[PDB]
Amino acid sequence: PISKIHARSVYDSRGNPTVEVDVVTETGLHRAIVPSQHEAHELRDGDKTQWGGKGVLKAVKNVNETIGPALIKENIDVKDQSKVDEFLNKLDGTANKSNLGANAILGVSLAVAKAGAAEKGVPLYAHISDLAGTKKPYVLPVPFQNVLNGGSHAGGRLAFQEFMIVPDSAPSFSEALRQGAEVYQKLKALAKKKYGQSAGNVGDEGGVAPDIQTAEEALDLITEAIEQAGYTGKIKIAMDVASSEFYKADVKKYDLDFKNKWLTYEQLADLYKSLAAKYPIVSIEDPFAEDDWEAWSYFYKTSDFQIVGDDLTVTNPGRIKKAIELKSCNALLLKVNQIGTLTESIQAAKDSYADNWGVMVSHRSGETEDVTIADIAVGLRSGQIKTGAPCRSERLAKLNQILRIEEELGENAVYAGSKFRTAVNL
Amino acid sequence: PISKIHARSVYDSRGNPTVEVDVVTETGLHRAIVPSGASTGQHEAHELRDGDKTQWGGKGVLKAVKNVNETIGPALIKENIDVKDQSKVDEFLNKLDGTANKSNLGANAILGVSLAVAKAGAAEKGVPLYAHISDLAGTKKPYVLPVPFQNVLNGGSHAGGRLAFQEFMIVPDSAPSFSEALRQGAEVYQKLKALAKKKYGQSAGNVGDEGGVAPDIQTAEEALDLITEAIEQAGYTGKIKIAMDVASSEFYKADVKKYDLDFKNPESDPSKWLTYEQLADLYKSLAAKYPIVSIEDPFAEDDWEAWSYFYKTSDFQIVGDDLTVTNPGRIKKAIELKSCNALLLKVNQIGTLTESIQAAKDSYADNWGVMVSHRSGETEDVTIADIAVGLRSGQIKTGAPCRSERLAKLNQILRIEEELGENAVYAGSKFRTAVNL
Numbered sequence: 001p002i003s004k005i006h007a008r009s010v011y012d013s014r015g016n017p018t019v020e021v022d023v024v025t026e027t028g029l030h031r032a033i034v035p036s037q038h039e040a041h042e043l044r045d046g047d048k049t050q051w052g053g054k055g056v057l058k059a060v061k062n063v064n065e066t067i068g069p070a071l072i073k074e075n076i077d078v079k080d081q082s083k084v085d086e087f088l089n090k091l092d093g094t095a096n097k098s099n100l101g102a103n104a105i106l107g108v109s110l111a112v113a114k115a116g117a118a119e120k121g122v123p124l125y126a127h128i129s130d131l132a133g134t135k136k137p138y139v140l141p142v143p144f145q146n147v148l149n150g151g152s153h154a155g156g157r158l159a160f161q162e163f164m165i166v167p168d169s170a171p172s173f174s175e176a177l178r179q180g181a182e183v184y185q186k187l188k189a190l191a192k193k194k195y196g197q198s199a200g201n202v203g204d205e206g207g208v209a210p211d212i213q214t215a216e217e218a219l220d221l222i223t224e225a226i227e228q229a230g231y232t233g234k235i236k237i238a239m240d241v242a243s244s245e246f247y248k249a250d251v252k253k254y255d256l257d258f259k260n261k262w263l264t265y266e267q268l269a270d271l272y273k274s275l276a277a278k279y280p281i282v283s284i285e286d287p288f289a290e291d292d293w294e295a296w297s298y299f300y301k302t303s304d305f306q307i308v309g310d311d312l313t314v315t316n317p318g319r320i321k322k323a324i325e326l327k328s329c330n331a332l333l334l335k336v337n338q339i340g341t342l343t344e345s346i347q348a349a350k351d352s353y354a355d356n357w358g359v360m361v362s363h364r365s366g367e368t369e370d371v372t373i374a375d376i377a378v379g380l381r382s383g384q385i386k387t388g389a390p391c392r393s394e395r396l397a398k399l400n401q402i403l404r405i406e407e408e409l410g411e412n413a414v415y416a417g418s419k420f421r422t423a424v425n426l
Numbered sequence: 427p428i429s430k431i432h433a434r435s436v437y438d439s440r441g442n443p444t445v446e447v448d449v450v451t452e453t454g455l456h457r458a459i460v461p462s463g464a465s466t467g468q469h470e471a472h473e474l475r476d477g478d479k480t481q482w483g484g485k486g487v488l489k490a491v492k493n494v495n496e497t498i499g500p501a502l503i504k505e506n507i508d509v510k511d512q513s514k515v516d517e518f519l520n521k522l523d524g525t526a527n528k529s530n531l532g533a534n535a536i537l538g539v540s541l542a543v544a545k546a547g548a549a550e551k552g553v554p555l556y557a558h559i560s561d562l563a564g565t566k567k568p569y570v571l572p573v574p575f576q577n578v579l580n581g582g583s584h585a586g587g588r589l590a591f592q593e594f595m596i597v598p599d600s601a602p603s604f605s606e607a608l609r610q611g612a613e614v615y616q617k618l619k620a621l622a623k624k625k626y627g628q629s630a631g632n633v634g635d636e637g638g639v640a641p642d643i644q645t646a647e648e649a650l651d652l653i654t655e656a657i658e659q660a661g662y663t664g665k666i667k668i669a670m671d672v673a674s675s676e677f678y679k680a681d682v683k684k685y686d687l688d689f690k691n692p693e694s695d696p697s698k699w700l701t702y703e704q705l706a707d708l709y710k711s712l713a714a715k716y717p718i719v720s721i722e723d724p725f726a727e728d729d730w731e732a733w734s735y736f737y738k739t740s741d742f743q744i745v746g747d748d749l750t751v752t753n754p755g756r757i758k759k760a761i762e763l764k765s766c767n768a769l770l771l772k773v774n775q776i777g778t779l780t781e782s783i784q785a786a787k788d789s790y791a792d793n794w795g796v797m798v799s800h801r802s803g804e805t806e807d808v809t810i811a812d813i814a815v816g817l818r819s820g821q822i823k824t825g826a827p828c829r830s831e832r833l834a835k836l837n838q839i840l841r842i843e844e845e846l847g848e849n850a851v852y853a854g855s856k857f858r859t860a861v862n863l
């Protein structure tokens with residue numbers, strides 16, 4: 001039985017409060033931290049005198065005073081994650097988890113999952129593999145590393161949000177990490193040399209954000225850095241456009257200079273096609289806005305690369321079903337706190353796998369020292385993880401955790417490599 | 427009886443390899459990760475790097491990891507030392523290395539075993555690490571939670587820009603608790619970040635190695651005005667003080683005995699280079715104008731004359747970092763010459779927990795303050811949080827409230843604070859003397 005459930009406020013990587021939950025069982029303490037339009041509703045305090053309104057005292061209170069005591073009295077076996085998460089949603093009673101807070105619910109859900117793994121005597125990724133029905137051997141994910149940032153994070157005209165390197169040709173996860181780390185060091189030096197010493201400072205996810213004007217300008221910098229590291233042809237490129245940030249819905253046009261020409265979705269698709277034929281771009285996330293379903297489907301029809309829903313799908317089985325039915329995208333960016341329980345997150349992955357989607361387990365821009373998503377990526381056999389540049393330990397702690405899993409599993413794990421889109425069946 | 431000692435390579439917060447060590451006992455797995463500095467002093471214990479320029483730009487730690495797995499690990503298991511006898515362990519680790527600067531097996535190889543064994547020793551006692559370190563250091567109860575010195579504006583070798591001084595810190599010492607001090611600093615930091623973007627552009631909001639904003643500014647006066655304005659916007663003027671880590675060894679021109687406040691720009695202007703007297707005048711002017719309560723490395727690592735000259739006139743905290751390199755022999759010299767009145771304690775500058783504790787005890791003996799410190803290359807490891815509490819130092823330096831290699835330490839003290847309740851007190855305004863609080 002659970003002997004203790006207790007939450008507290010801790011700080012995420014941006015300096016904002018977030019929820020940490022302890023679940024104590026006979027196997028010890030099991031801890032999880034929650035990261036930070038159609039997303040599950042996180043509960044913030046809204047006291048403008050406290051953390052600028054971003055406190056989580058009410059969500060922590062909901063764990064300590066409401067969820068905790070109820071779950072203990074309900075006396076659910078901690079291995080039965082589905083039953084735990086069903087009970088959590090029953091307690092909340094709202095579709096968007098706005099009664100108790102999605103951050104309150106997820107914190108309990110993730111901490112109980114670790115208690116369940118411990119009860120089974122297996123690490124969390126093995127437990128998640130059981131919960132998700134993924135086969136052996138385990139698949140280690142290709143890291144999609146956001147080394148250069150634009151859009152809302154940068155000061156140049158560059159509208160696209162994230163430029164990533166993809167070390168998919170490496171024989172092992174460990175070698176892929178070394179490759180990406182070496183490329184990143186080259187890029188940081190290039191950014192400082194070509195744009196000034198201030199260009200080496202990093203944004204929220206550990207990448208640089210110089211004053212870049214065009215997408216080709218950013219891709220050439222990455223291309224140059226891959227070459228200096230000696231990995232041209234061994235490392236691919238991915239993008240997170242976050243096009244919702246510059247979609248003018250009234251005119252159905254996209255503003256590539258939204259921080260200072262506007263493109264229809266057909267013209268923006270032409271630009272992606274031109275970039276994808278010139279650069280080794282194997283994955284594009286949110287190329288069109290979160291409700292611009294016609295644009296996604298138009299783009300899906302012609303594209304042989306990965307098309308990742310983020311704001312489009314918000315880890316939400318209802319939005320995934322729509323995207324499957326309308327053939328809008330072929331991969332899911334899985335953010336557990338967008339849906340708010342581990343079971344619903346696993347279902348979202350399962351629903352994506354059923355349509356032969358790739359699944360890229362993802363961090364949030366506000367991360368913590370928590371490494372749960374590393375185990376989630378391995379347990380889901382997703383073969384892809386998006387958890388930042390190789391910089392800032394809220395990003396690297398996830399990578400370090402996969403290094404530990406890699407070493408622990410030895411031959412019972414294989415690197416997804418170039419098959420990351422289909423790694424669940426690799 | 428240790429059942430297993432195993433090291434691996436992991437990545438620190440700058441993306442460089444470092445050593446992580448597992449020690450497995452009856453109580454389970456105990457793990458520690460070694461940090462890595464950027465503005466490293468010449469006298470620090472020797473960090474063993476691979477130097478293979480085709481791998482991590484030469485910064486691999488495979489050789490250090492091998493030393494743990496092949497040499498240190500098996501020798502420590504066979505020696506069968508009780509894991510809670512930290513002194514005997516660190517005595518044995520140093521005997522194995524046999525050199526003064528730990529250049530044989532590597533200070534990063536040695537420290538990882540030292541800290542992982544320390545967590546094993548704490549667990550055999552059934553107490554948290556901070557309580558075990560309090561036993562080892564002989565520090566009294568109740569526990570003292572440290573004032574977080576928060577480097578919210580980065581300069582020097584930690585960030586890109588024209589700012590010579592390395593670190594500008596806020597010091598929430600008036601707060602009634604550690605938890606409230608953290609909220610105050612977090613609120614100031616958010617005001618500062620928005621203010622830096624407004625006055626210097628969106629790029630000024632990007633952060634340096636330790637999570638502080640790095641606006642392209644020239645003088646310390648500009649950095650201090652920005653922090654002052656942020657403190658006022660957050661409503662904490664008079665409640666939060668300011669500290670600096672000049673890291674002046676980075677811009678000391680040793681041959682001419684001058685200090686270059688524009689060392690980032692090849693624009694020499696050697697007439698703008700300052701003698702230590704002129705640099706001391708600058709510190710005095712800043713300390714009389716701003717609420718500066720602590721200045722770290724105001725003069726170079728072997729400019730003992732400058733330190734002593736400054737110490738004589740200064741009532742604020744003067745912190746040795748590169749001067750003392752957490753080294754009892756250098757601390758003795760600084761005591762004898764009256765060079766500084768506080769130790770910046772970096773465990774990986776000396777390479778074992780026991781020597782680090784000795785460095786703190788030697789400092790306390792001269793009524794020094796002790797500020798437990800991160801390195802600029804940090805990890806998800808939180809050991810220094812338990813060290814700061816265990817040593818009753820009352821001050822910690824572990825970053826801006828930004829980037830989780832910094833916040834993980836602060837979060838760990840939040841957990842200690844909640845765990846201890848009334849059995850702990852916030853050092854507050856008495857951080858310089860917290861060991862005797």
Ligand SMILES: O=C(O)[C@@H](CO)OP(=O)(O)O
Nearest residue numbers: 036240310363364365366
């Ligand atoms: O857009 C994304 O993929 C991530 C950031 O990488 O989302 P968020 O910023 O909302 O956490």
Ligand SMILES: O=C(O)[C@@H](CO)OP(=O)(O)O
Nearest residue numbers: 463464465466800801802
């Ligand atoms: O100079 C310092 O005080 C430290 C921590 O801020 O930096 P580094 O680890 O690079 O020496």
Ligand SMILES: [Mg+2]
Nearest residue numbers: 240242286310
């Ligand atoms: Mg996105």
Ligand SMILES: [Mg+2]
Nearest residue numbers: 671673722747
């Ligand atoms: Mg220093």
